[PDB]
Design a protein around this ligand. Structure first.
Ligand SMILES: O=C(O)c1cc(=O)[nH]c(=O)[nH]1
Length: 224
């Protein structure tokens, strides 16, 4: 399938510069199965963050690698399928900040699809992993794809708030700071930072203050 077939219209145009790289990663995953190795998430979920409208993205949440545990990774950073229990530690931590910052009760489950619908891009820098082998697909070719995605997002004549939850600020800030209406939430605690900087970081309320300050609508963060 060409990009226009795999991702939303705006994303297919945004990702044209890395269309050969996206083809190549498809070949890599087929070669992994031939090699007798597995990957997550499911092939159908790998580009899932790019199936929500490129023009409507208001917030970027950056992760590093998909969940390594079988049955966790669903192609949106930190999300899990609605029947997954208990939550992964990172997600439990995110939901504790969610209740504290926003005053909402604990979500009913770990499915962040509503954030994706509302223009929250849940982007991992690396979109696949070998099950039970954390960070096993680093350097396989995803970094160039997700860099093109972020630079394209930054280049829009449109507001963006970046939240960095994958700790690589010195690699990510240059891709973004080259934008016109991008605010980066600093500092950069990750959800596993927990009480050493993540809890009380107010990422959700701060993103809305920053969007309203750039003349955009806030995100409705409320999960079921
Ligand atoms: O393993 C994690 O907590 C994790 C999941 C995910 O999607 N992204 C990330 O950076 N970490």
């Amino acid at each position: 399938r060409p990009l226009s077939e795999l991702v939303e219209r705006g994303w297919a145009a945004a990702l044209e510069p890395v269309a050969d790289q996206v083809a190549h990663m498809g070949q890599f995953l087929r070669a992994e199965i031939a090699a007798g190795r597995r990957y997550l998430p499911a092939g159908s979920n790998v580009l899932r963050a790019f199936t929500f409208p490129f023009d409507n993205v208001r917030v970027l949440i950056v992760g590093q690698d998909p969940y390594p545990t079988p049955g966790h990774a669903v192609g949106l950073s930190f999300s899990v399928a609605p029947d997954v229990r208990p939550w992964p530690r990172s997600l439990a931590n995110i939901f504790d900040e969610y209740t504290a910052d926003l005053g909402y009760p604990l979500p009913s489950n770990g499915d962040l699809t509503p954030w994706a619908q509302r223009g929250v891009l849940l982007l991992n820098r690396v979109l696949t992993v070998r099950p039970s082998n954390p960070a096993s697909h680093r350097g396989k070719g995803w970094e160039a794809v997700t860099e093109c995605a972020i630079r394209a997002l930054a280049a829009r004549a449109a507001p963006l708030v970046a939240i960095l939850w994958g700790r690589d600020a010195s690699t990510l800030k240059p891709m973004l700071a080259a934008g016109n209406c991008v605010a980066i939430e600093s500092p950069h605690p990750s959800p596993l930072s927990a009480s050493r900087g993540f809890f009380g970081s107010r990422p959700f309320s701060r993103a809305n203050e920053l969007l309203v300050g750039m003349g955009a609508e806030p995100i409705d963060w409320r999960l079921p």
